Amino acid sequence: SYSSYLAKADQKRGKKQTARETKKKVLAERRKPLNIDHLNEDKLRDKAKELWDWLYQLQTEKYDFAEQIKRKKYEIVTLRNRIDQAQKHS
């Protein structure tokens, strides 16, 4: 089975490269430059925190997405045991 080796390259490289740009497209949208540079002095104040909240915003979400996979990862472990337990090739 070595004629399938060319399938690995094509496939993997393919999907992986597809995923990349998507991530880039996606992430790019959610990005508004720091255009506001030297337009006011107290502006920075009302600005800086807004950035701060956005960060905290994202941060908090990342934490949740995180804890979520963990919980799901456990859903799996169990869902796998139910699969084996429910084998009985009788």
Partner 1 sequence: EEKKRRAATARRQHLKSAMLQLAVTEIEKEAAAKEVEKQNYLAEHSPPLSLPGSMQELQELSKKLHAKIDSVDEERYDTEVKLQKTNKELEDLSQKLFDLRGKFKRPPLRRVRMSADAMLRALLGSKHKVNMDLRANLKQV
Partner 2 sequence: TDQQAEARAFLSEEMIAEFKAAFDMFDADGGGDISTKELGTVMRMLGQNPTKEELDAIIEEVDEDGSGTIDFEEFLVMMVRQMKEDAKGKSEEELANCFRIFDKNADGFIDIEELGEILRATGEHVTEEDIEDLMKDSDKNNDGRIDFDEFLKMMEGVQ
* Two tokens, residue 40: 């006011």
Phi and psi, residue 31, nearest 5°: -130, 115
**DSSP conformational letter for 86:** T
x/- map, 67-86, partner 2, by CB under 8 A = -------x--xx-xxx--xx
Query: Which element (helix H / strand E) includes 88?
Result: none
Q: Does 27 bind partner 1 (CB under 8 A)?
A: yes
Q: Report if residue 89 touches partner 2, rule: CB under 8 A.
A: no
Q: Are 19 and 11 in contact (CB under 8 A)?
A: no
Q: Which x/- pattern over 35-64 shows residues binding partner 1 (rule: CB under 8 A)?
A: --xx--xx-xx-xxx-xx-xxx-xxxxxx-
Residues that bind partner 2 (CB under 8 A): 74, 77-78, 80-82, 85-86
